[PDB]
Amino acid sequence: IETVPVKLKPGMDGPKVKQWPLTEEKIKALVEICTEMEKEGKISKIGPENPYNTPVFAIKKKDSTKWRKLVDFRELNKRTQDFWEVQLGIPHPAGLKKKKSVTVLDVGDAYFSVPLDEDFRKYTAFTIPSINNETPGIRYQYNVLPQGWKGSPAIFQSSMTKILEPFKKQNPDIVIYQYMDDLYVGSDLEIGQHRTKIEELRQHLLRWGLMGYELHPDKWTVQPIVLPEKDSWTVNDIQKLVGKLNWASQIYPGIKVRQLCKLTKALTEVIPLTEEAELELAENREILKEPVHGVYYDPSKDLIAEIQKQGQGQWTYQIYQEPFKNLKTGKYAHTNDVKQLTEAVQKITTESIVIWGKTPKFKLPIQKETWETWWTEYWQATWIPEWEFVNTPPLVKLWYQ
Amino acid sequence: PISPIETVPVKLKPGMDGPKVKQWPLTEEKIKALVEICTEMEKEGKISKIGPENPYNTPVFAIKKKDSTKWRKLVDFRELNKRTQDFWEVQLGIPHPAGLKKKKSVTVLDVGDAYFSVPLDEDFRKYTAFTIPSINNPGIRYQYNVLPQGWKGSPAIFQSSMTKILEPFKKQNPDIVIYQYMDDLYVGSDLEIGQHRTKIEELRQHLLRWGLTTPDKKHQKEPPFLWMGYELHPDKWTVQPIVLPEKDSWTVNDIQKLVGKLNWASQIYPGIKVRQLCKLLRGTKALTEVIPLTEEAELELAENREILKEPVHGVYYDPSKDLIAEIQKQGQGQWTYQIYQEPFKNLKTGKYARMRGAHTNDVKQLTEAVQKITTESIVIWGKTPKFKLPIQKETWETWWTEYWQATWIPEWEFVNTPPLVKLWYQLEKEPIVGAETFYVDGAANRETKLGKAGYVTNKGRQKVVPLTNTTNQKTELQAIYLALQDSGLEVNIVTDSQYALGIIQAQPDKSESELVNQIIEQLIKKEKVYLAWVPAHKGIGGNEQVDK
Ligand SMILES: O=C1c2ccccc2C(=O)N1CCOC(=S)Nc1ccc(Br)cc1
Numbered sequence: 001i002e003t004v005p006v007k008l009k010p011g012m013d014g015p016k017v018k019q020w021p022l023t024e025e026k027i028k029a030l031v032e033i034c035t036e037m038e039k040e041g042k043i044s045k046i047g048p049e050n051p052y053n054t055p056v057f058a059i060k061k062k063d064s065t066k067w068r069k070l071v072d073f074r075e076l077n078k079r080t081q082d083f084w085e086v087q088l089g090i091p092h093p094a095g096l097k098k099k100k101s102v103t104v105l106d107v108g109d110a111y112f113s114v115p116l117d118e119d120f121r122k123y124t125a126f127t128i129p130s131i132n133n134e135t136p137g138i139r140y141q142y143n144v145l146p147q148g149w150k151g152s153p154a155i156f157q158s159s160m161t162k163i164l165e166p167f168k169k170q171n172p173d174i175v176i177y178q179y180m181d182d183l184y185v186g187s188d189l190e191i192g193q194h195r196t197k198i199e200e201l202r203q204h205l206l207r208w209g210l211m212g213y214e215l216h217p218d219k220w221t222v223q224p225i226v227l228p229e230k231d232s233w234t235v236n237d238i239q240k241l242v243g244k245l246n247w248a249s250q251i252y253p254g255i256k257v258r259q260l261c262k263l264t265k266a267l268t269e270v271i272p273l274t275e276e277a278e279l280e281l282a283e284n285r286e287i288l289k290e291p292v293h294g295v296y297y298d299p300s301k302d303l304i305a306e307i308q309k310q311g312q313g314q315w316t317y318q319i320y321q322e323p324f325k326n327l328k329t330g331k332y333a334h335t336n337d338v339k340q341l342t343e344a345v346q347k348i349t350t351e352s353i354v355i356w357g358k359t360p361k362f363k364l365p366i367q368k369e370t371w372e373t374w375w376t377e378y379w380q381a382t383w384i385p386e387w388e389f390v391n392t393p394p395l396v397k398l399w400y401q
Numbered sequence: 402p403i404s405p406i407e408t409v410p411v412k413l414k415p416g417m418d419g420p421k422v423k424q425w426p427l428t429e430e431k432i433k434a435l436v437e438i439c440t441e442m443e444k445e446g447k448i449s450k451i452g453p454e455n456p457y458n459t460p461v462f463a464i465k466k467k468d469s470t471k472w473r474k475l476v477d478f479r480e481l482n483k484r485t486q487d488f489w490e491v492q493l494g495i496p497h498p499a500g501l502k503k504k505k506s507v508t509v510l511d512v513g514d515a516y517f518s519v520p521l522d523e524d525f526r527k528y529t530a531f532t533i534p535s536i537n538n539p540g541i542r543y544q545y546n547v548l549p550q551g552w553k554g555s556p557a558i559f560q561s562s563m564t565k566i567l568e569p570f571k572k573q574n575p576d577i578v579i580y581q582y583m584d585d586l587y588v589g590s591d592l593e594i595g596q597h598r599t600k601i602e603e604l605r606q607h608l609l610r611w612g613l614t615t616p617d618k619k620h621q622k623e624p625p626f627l628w629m630g631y632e633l634h635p636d637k638w639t640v641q642p643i644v645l646p647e648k649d650s651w652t653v654n655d656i657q658k659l660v661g662k663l664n665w666a667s668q669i670y671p672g673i674k675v676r677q678l679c680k681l682l683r684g685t686k687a688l689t690e691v692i693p694l695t696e697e698a699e700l701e702l703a704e705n706r707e708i709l710k711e712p713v714h715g716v717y718y719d720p721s722k723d724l725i726a727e728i729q730k731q732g733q734g735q736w737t738y739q740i741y742q743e744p745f746k747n748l749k750t751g752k753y754a755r756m757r758g759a760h761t762n763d764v765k766q767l768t769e770a771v772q773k774i775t776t777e778s779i780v781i782w783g784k785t786p787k788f789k790l791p792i793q794k795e796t797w798e799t800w801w802t803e804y805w806q807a808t809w810i811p812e813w814e815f816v817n818t819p820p821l822v823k824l825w826y827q828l829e830k831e832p833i834v835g836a837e838t839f840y841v842d843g844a845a846n847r848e849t850k851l852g853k854a855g856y857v858t859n860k861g862r863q864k865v866v867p868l869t870n871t872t873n874q875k876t877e878l879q880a881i882y883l884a885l886q887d888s889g890l891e892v893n894i895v896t897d898s899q900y901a902l903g904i905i906q907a908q909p910d911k912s913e914s915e916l917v918n919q920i921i922e923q924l925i926k927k928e929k930v931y932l933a934w935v936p937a938h939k940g941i942g943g944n945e946q947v948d949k
Pocket residue numbers: 133134496501502503504507578579580587588589624626628633634635636717
């Protein structure tokens with residue numbers, strides 16, 4: 001029946017964002033993928049009386065050759081904020097992360113059922129561009145729950161709950177989280193049965209539709225910080241040692257870089273093992289294979305993700321809210337920098353989404369213009385996190401090497 | 402006429418209402434005029450008389466038109482405009498002649514009284530009310546039924562109004578290309594003389610059925626064309642005639658215009674430098690100032706005037722064929738490039754100087770250009786071109802891999818245009834056996850601008866120069882530099898401040914900064930340099946000592 005009187009944040013207008021210049025194949029795809037959609041009544045053109053705009057891209061499923069259309073409601077979401085968050089937002093089960101394995105299900109084509117609050121349809125305006133701007137460019141609007149939009153789940157919520165009732169009822173141990181367009185379900189059931197239970201779940205959906213993605217958070221554990229083991233030891237090697245310990249010292253309340261640091265000298269000159277500095281590495285090594293004591297997750301502040309590139313298709317990433325207060329730190333491994341990072345990001349995000357229920361702020365070690373040109377090609381997720389390009393400090397890259 | 406097209410529901414902003422602005426008396430004939438004009442527009446329906454009920458009004462003045470001796474009705478809507486709404490941007494981007502597919506026959510049509518031919522929204526006409534004064538404050542007032550000239554939504558609505566009015570006919574003729582730039586229709590087809598002119602009388606009728614008039618049968622226009630600074634033939638394209646009248650004295654202005662004209666010609670004219678002409682534009686100059694033409698300039702202008710001599714021409718696009726794009730090193734921070742499909746018949750040229758960044762090495766500079774060109778090719782031809790570059794697949798690999806940041810060029814080949822791009826020096830992966838260890842350091846009094854940059858050594862040595870007006874961020878790039886001169890060819894250096902490390906750590910091969918520069922040649926001279934860092938002010942052998 002009638003829709004949820006969607007209401008924006010007083011003291012702000014809709015979004016108005018330029019359309020990315022898109023390749024021929026993405027434009028083709030979108031125009032077709034969009035002709036039907038209106039046909040299907042899910043959208044309809046719009047007059048010039050609509051100032052608003054949102055970017056949109058085309059992506060491919062799981063490497064598959066079928067184009068999925070991706071709208072970037074990144075902005076709009078901020079404008080709706082309080083509504084989808086402090087209004088009807090869905091809570092987050094700390095249970096998820098704990099399950100032995102979690103499948104991620106794309107259940108967003110469901111929204112295209114529920115109707116969008118008419119008076120709110122204008123905000124969802126987007127635009128299919130044109131090669132060399134030789135023709136104006138088709139302009140559309142949503143008259144239903146859009147996908148990449150954070151407003152959709154909050155609304156569809158109530159429905160979703162009901163759809164899941166019976167199932168959940170029959171296995172009060174499966175934990176179903178919901179974050180934009182996708183459903184996260186976890187269970188400690190050996191794989192076979194999990195896969196079963198998920199496929200079984202699939203079935204419920206089908207009807208309300210008016211195995212898969214195997215992910216196992218349980219086996220996650222913070223990437224330690226390693227200090228070489230050597231056997232020779234020279235100024236340089238020991239000089240770097242402390243340098244690192246200097247950084248460590250920073251965080252990890254307890255780090256001790258004295259006996260070592262206290263040991264002029266010639267660079268290439270090798271030396272021994274300090275009678276009783278051994279306990280330095282020994283003791284220090286310890287607290288490093290450890291989780292930063294004193295660091296906790298603040299829900300009121302948002303998450304921040306940092307990635308540095310270490311040659312050899314290797315990448316190290318830390319997650320924190322307060323510089324040098326790491327909550328998470330891991331790594332990740334047609335070979336191009338851009339693709340790999342794009343993957344790392346998605347990887348990081350997911351984990352983040354599974355741990356805290358929100359996406360981090362990314363600091364991408366790359367030229368904006370370049371990322372801002374290629375990311376789509378290897379992008380598959382149905383969400384888009386916040387990012388900001390930077391220049392990697394020198395030693396850093398090393399300290400996490 | 403007034404198009405029978407549907408209307409666009411216009412609207413005001415939320416907490417706002419119509420415009421009401423005192424209409425201040427006009428002069429004798431100005432009135433006479435405005436009355437004459439208005440009578441006609443009404444005689445057609447452009448306007449219609451409103452009672453005294455309409456609370457709303459916007460000022461209206463006339464103005465003598467230079468041509469012949471006629472007045473023109475002119476109505477500032479500043480108010481009705483400030484109070485109106487926002488519209489889908491009319492401005493978004495112009496095509497580029499190079500992006501255009503090649504057509505056989507082509508003709509432009511200009512639209513009669515466009516604006517006054519599109520019917521404004523009924524429920525909005527009330528807000529356009531304006532008043533023709535009496536020789537001295539009885540009154541007489543009108544309203545708009547069509548799009549007012551200086552309004553605000555007028556542009557948008559028109560553009561929209563026309564796309565549709567054009568929609569069908571297009572469906573009817575999928576092969577045709579129509580482009581809409583203001584009071585102008587550009588029509589292109591590969592069909593020849595015979596069925597093109599006929600193909601037009603067609604469009605003409607179509608446009609008429611929808612209320613728009615056009616130039617006469619034998620009363621139109623043919624290429625070359627002028628448009629946004631271009632000259633457009635149905636097979637080729639160029640920038641419009643660019644003249645440089647001879648002159649001995651150039652005002653700051655003169656040359657700005659010069660530089661401007663020149664930067665434009667570079668879309669199609671290969672080999673146009675304006676670098677020694679931008680120098681000349683250095684400092685708080687005052688437009689009217691006369692500037693001497695430092696040798697470089699003069700030389701330029703000529704080689705510029707030369708290249709210009711011969712008229713040149715870009716070609717159009719062939720969707721089937723690939724896009725070849727090949728860059729060239731043109732000298733210290735300057736890069737030129739051409740894009741083409743066949744022998745060497747460019748579709749467009751272009752250049753690149755965007756040398757932002759403090760310290761930079763060719764490689765990067767070169768890559769940056771690829772990016773630049775990449776995006777550019779994407780919007781014009783909806784696809785990325787294959788690249789041919791003045792760099793060895795290897796010299797690149799070596800770089801991109803050791804480098805911290807992320808990169809990715811599309812597909813490219815090596816060319817041998819002999820200003821090849823290379824790494825002018827390499828740091829040392831590990832320390833160096835039998836090399837003076839240099840614990841360097843730069844200091845300074847934070848409140849006097851005086852410090853001291855010295856260095857020790859595992860070999861007993863010791864030194865310290867007297868630094869005048871330098872910040873840590875400069876004395877440090879001096880603790881090093883020093884250690885570069887007093888050491889042999891193979892050294893070990895050790896500084897604090899990631900800063901110094903940062904910059905050097907990044908094999909930069911030229912900087913806007915003499916000092917760094919120096920410390921560059923120094924390296925290009927050496928034969929083995931290892932750069933190491935340590936926790937600034939701590940109890941560390943070496944660094945401690947130097948700390949005095
Ligand atoms: O006719 C025009 C224009 C005229 C001026 C500026 C832009 C265009 C345009 O996109 N179109 C439609 C496409 O035209 C194409 S594909 N090819 C042309 C068109 C017109 C000429 Br003179 C030469 C080549």
